[PDB]
Design a protein around this ligand. Sequence first.
Ligand SMILES: Nc1ncnc2c1ncn2[C@@H]1O[C@H](COP(=O)(O)OP(=O)(O)O)[C@@H](O)[C@H]1O
Ligand SMILES: [Mn+2]
Length: 430
Amino acid sequence: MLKKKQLTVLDLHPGAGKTRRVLPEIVREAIKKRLRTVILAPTRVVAAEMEEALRGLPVRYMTTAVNVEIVDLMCHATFTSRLLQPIRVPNYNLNIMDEAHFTDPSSIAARGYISTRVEMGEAAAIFMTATPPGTRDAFPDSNSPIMDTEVEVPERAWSSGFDWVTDHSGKTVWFVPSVRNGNEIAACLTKAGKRVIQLSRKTFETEFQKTKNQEWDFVITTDISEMGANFKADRVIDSRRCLKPVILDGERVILAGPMPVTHASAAQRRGRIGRNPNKPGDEYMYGGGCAETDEGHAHWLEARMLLDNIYLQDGLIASLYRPEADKVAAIEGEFKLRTEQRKTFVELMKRGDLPVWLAYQVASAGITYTDRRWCFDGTTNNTIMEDSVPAEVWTKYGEKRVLKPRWMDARVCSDHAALKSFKEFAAGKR
Ligand SMILES: Nc1ncnc2c1ncn2[C@@H]1O[C@H](COP(=O)(O)OP(=O)(O)O)[C@@H](O)[C@H]1O
Ligand SMILES: [Mn+2]
């Protein structure tokens, strides 16, 4: 697997031991061969788990998530961020991506960068995932048999007709299509006397610990838990539905759907259970079919925005990883920014915590990071609502204004927490 100019897809079925058994073997061999190696973990939670699997081995943990060399370990997003910034990144001879199905824009971009370096003959790479891009198998092998049942799954509060949900006496991981939908289901379950933990992208690294430290009956989670999150559960309830960010008329981003998940997403959701060879009969209840909803999904356009701004060699631009390259229609290099606008782009995404697409619109317009006039001078149909009335903030000048951004990205106000963060941004508070 370790030879140069080779990209290996390590696609053992879920729970087969890719992360805990195969990975340390790979690391020991890479150290013996003096290969400069990067290990890419999807989340800080997984990075901390990897330190336990890699205990003893000389690995530099480039994250504060690990309380503790020619092997570096960092998060997917950190790798892509460092490539975008002036910071020097080693030309790693061996690039290991764990949970390489992650569809975050930074993860897609990292796969494009790594796979291009391999294609140029400069490096080796190992992509670890049970569900490579394009998988059509929602029901892969597992360590113990799974009971699969197609069934109508509630997506709103319910009173009758779903007794099977609450009659269960084990622990359930329930994949919902959005934070707001999960809030409603959570409230309904809590009213029925269940103890519920909710997880989403921005709360995961913090709230996941409650699944170890607290008694719980349900974990209500968005698709973030598709990325190596381990639960001691015996049932998965899968709405089989997700929101799809879509760029409309090249001018705005909406959150379309909910709509079907990909086969890979469904397989990863189901793959939370059936992982213990000593506990057969975990249950997977699924509420819809699968479809290729990554086609036209904004994350792959946003990956091209990132990759267009990563230096590879002179003027060349890395391509997306071939199996996922057709999921976006874009002109190669069309998002490349000059030095100063690229710095603004990066700052809008990191400190600004704006979605990639929105950060690009602002930076490519020549706006500097601290200049928030664009948050207020949009068209009337770009007005953002809070509790059914136009949302308002005090500008950094002390004037109360309606939030009406020049470019509208639905992800800045899809839940209360997102809106709170964007209001603070519009006010100049970060
Ligand atoms: N902390 C742990 N202690 C013991 N076994 C674990 C632990 N975490 C995961 N496992 C088990 O180890 C096996 C392999 O896990 P893993 O390497 O994560 O599989 P994969 O990466 O192929 O999905 C699975 O059966 C999983 O349930
Ligand atoms: Mn794994």
